[PDB]
């Protein structure tokens, strides 16, 4: 028996020495050296410095450029708003609490951070799904005589918010719970504790099936269909050098987009699953810290991929940054 329990928490350290304290009440300098808490803060700082300019600029640039304000770009803006919830809901709270060495905001702060942070990274996830769907509809032309317009864009965005609430909301009201994770400085969802009073087990599954497998399948399907439709259109007109490049760039990108989706959620899935299936084992705070490192850095690498690598967006940015010129 590996941790120390308490009303709204679970410290991954043994109280046999009697040193363990509430993560809401006193520094956890026995889980990890103080320098490792500082390094945690170093990192949050990095993600705020990189994640906030990149994501905010995206919004700003859309305000300065009329050609960016098209339906096919609503979901990309949604993605940037979501990342901003991650940055302010998640990263800055964790910067502050890490510098105390414990979660100074109490259980309310825990629910709050937990909710917004969770809320942000799910809108992002689902944005990425919705996007592939739209891109598959528009290009693969699966429905005949259909043209994607502003009212589909909006539903797309709203479907994204609804799916997020469908997992950010439950733990606030009984199905699972938010508690400090890892080094106890940031509050996530409890998926590693079997806490029958809230039914952690069933939620963990539902999140796995609905908020992991579904998204994965859809993304793979849509981008499969699309790298297919484009590889075929290119075979059927090799006399176009342009159509040949287009099919090669679209493939390169889809690979990048898929691989980056896995790098972001696969760890969380891999751990969630392996914990679920080795329930009689001890997992360290730094073991819980890993999948969160990968999933959170997506507030930087996602805008890089879906925005800085989008020809339209990139140009407007360079314009805006170079003082109106070039």
């Amino acid at each position: 028996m590996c941790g120390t329990e308490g009303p709204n928490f679970y410290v991954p350290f043994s109280n046999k020495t009697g040193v363990v304290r509430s993560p809401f009440e006193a520094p956890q300098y026995y889980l990890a050296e103080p320098w490792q808490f500082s390094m945690l803060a170093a990192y949050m700082f990095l993600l705020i410095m990189l994640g906030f300019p990149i994501n905010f600029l995206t919004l700003y640039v859309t305000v300065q450029h009329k050609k960016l304000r098209t339906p096919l770009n609503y979901i990309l803006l949604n993605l940037a708003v979501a990342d901003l919830f991650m940055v302010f809901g998640g990263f800055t709270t964790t910067l502050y609490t890490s510098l105390h060495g414990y979660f100074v905001f109490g259980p309310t702060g825990c629910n709050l951070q937990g909710f917004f942070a969770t809320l942000g990274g799910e809108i992002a996830l689902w944005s990425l799904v919705v996007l592939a769907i739209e891109r598959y509809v528009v290009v693969c032309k699966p429905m005949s005589n259909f043209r994607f317009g502003e009212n589909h864009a909006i539903m797309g965005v709203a479907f994204t918010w609804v799916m997020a609430l469908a997992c950010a909301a439950p733990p606030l009201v009984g199905w699972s719970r938010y508690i400090p994770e890892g080094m106890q400085c940031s509050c996530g969802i409890d998926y590693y504790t079997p806490h029958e009073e809230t039914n952690n087990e069933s939620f963990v599954i539902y999140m796995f099936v609905v908020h992991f497998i579904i998204p994965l399948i859809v993304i793979f399907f849509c981008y499969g269909q699309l790298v297919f439709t484009v590889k075929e259109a290119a075979a059927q007109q090799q006399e176009s050098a342009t159509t040949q490049k287009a099919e090669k760039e679209v493939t390169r990108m889809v690979i990048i987009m898929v691989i980056a989706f896995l790098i972001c959620w696969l760890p969380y899935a891999g751990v969630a699953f392996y914990i679920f299936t080795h329930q009689g084992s001890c997992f360290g705070p730094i073991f819980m810290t890993i999948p969160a490192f990968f999933a959170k850095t997506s507030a930087v690498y996602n805008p890089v991929i879906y925005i800085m690598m989008n020809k339209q967006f990139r140009n407007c940015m360079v314009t805006t940054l170079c003082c109106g010129k070039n």
Binding site: T70, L72, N73, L76, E134, R135, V138, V139, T229, V230, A233, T242, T243, K245, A246, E249, V250, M253, N310, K311, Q312, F313
Partner: peptide
């Protein structure tokens, strides 16, 4: 396809 690709920011 090239025109739908451009619109998507894909090419």
């Amino acid at each position: 396809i090239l025109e739908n690709l451009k619109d998507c920011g894909l090419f």
